[PDB]
Amino acid sequence: SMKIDVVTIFPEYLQPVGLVDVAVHDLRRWTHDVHKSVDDSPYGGGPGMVMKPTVWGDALDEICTSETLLVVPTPAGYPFTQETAWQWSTEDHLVIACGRYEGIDQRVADDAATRMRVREVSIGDYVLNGGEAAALVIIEAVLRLVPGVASLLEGPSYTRPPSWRGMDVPPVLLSGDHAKIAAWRAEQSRQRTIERRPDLLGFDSP
Amino acid sequence: SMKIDVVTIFPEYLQPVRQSLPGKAIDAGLVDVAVHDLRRWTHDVHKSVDDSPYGGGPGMVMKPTVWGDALDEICTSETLLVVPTPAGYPFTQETAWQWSTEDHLVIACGRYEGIDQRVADDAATRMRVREVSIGDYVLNGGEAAALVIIEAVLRLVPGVASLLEGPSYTRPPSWRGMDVPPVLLSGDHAKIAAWRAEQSRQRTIERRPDLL
Ligand SMILES: Nc1cc(-c2ccc3ccn(Cc4ccc(CN5CCCCC5)cc4)c3c2)n[nH]1
Ligand SMILES: Nc1cc(-c2ccc3ccn(Cc4ccc(CN5CCCCC5)cc4)c3c2)n[nH]1
Incomplete structure (x- = not known):
């Protein structure tokens, strides 16, 4: 028995996904303007855009509890490995926050970690267009280990x-x-x- | 310009990434992603793609005869054949950069417990073959790996440390x-x-x- 909530601005992407329930949420549901703006330019400069913390904060407030494991895919994350999959396979509630643009304002994860366990993770040393493909990979690797499913x-x-x-x-x-x-x-x-x-x-890589 | 062919017993899995292609890149003939149902190349009424492993063990192994026909039809001598596998060489950003300049990628997505090794061995006698892993975890099949590889490669193709x-x-x-x-x-x-x-x-x- 596990619940997985996936939050994304592209819910259609998650279509390839009673021992487990998997729900997909459109981040834009938590916006208030008619433009439904979730991104803004980065402080300090640089290319592309950053996802605003405000919309994320509202979404995660609704979906998470103190017992939630919040998973945030990012190319700068701790490595997600088979060990991680085994560890998460016994969790009650995973919430996967999928970023787009150039990523999510760091305060979303930092703030969340005052309230729940947060895991910023990378699925490999390559750059995706957003967190959604990583969510599919994480969900696949974890669910096949769930009891009832070197x-x-x-x-x-x-x-x-x-x-x-x-x-x-x-x-x-x-x-x-x-x-x-x-x-x-x-x-x-x-x-x-x-x-x-x-x-x-334990040998040198090529 | 790059053509990507993906072969899978679950073609619907690749529907997201196909949709996510900008029309301008397609209209310009910059990129084309096609997805093929492996069972198109089965030989029997039961559309069998799997069989028991020699030497015993659990799970099933995908049949070489079916894959051999699929790749015969889809691949050419210029093809880079990509085979996701948890036992593969590591796929990294360096790999993504390299493959972004290829004209034709074919991604063979396994299921069950993998593909008879002779499929890759035979293919390697007339095209370049790359068995690759996207990370140190085990998936249920190659389709999620194909999604990852396609995304990582195509964002490096202009207009698609x-x-x-x-x-x-x-x-x-x-x-x-x-x-x-x-x-x-x-x-x-x-x-x-x-x-x-x-x-x-x-x-x-x-x-x-x-x-x-
Ligand atoms: N293991 C893994 C997880 C992801 C992932 C996860 C979540 C998001 C949200 C957006 N993106 C795309 C993105 C992220 C960062 C940059 C900045 N960038 C830093 C690296 C070099 C190039 C410049 C550019 C684009 C994401 C990518 N990719 N790979
Ligand atoms: N980077 C990465 C690529 C894949 C991938 C790619 C393609 C296929 C096709 C089938 N599967 C599932 C599978 C393969 C092998 C085993 C047995 N094996 C023996 C002992 C050690 C644990 C596993 C079990 C299930 C695939 C998995 N997973 N992770």
């Missing part, structure tokens, strides 16, 4: 036919020897890990 | 007892730049020490 890369998998275009499934996998298969898979995992993610085994 | 970025602020100058840092209102633009650099350094130390 440091190595997985090796290759195969299925029928045993030969295809002159490419054979590795013979050990057809041998029925559970121990030999286990050993081979363990070796494949470690070789793939040293090739693709040597950092996971 | 070492440290973490610091905090941003806008009006009002005071909100819930919190003032915007006075330096940002100082009109001392060299000082502002130095303040922002220190915020960046501090945030990187706190959140991502690995980057230093």
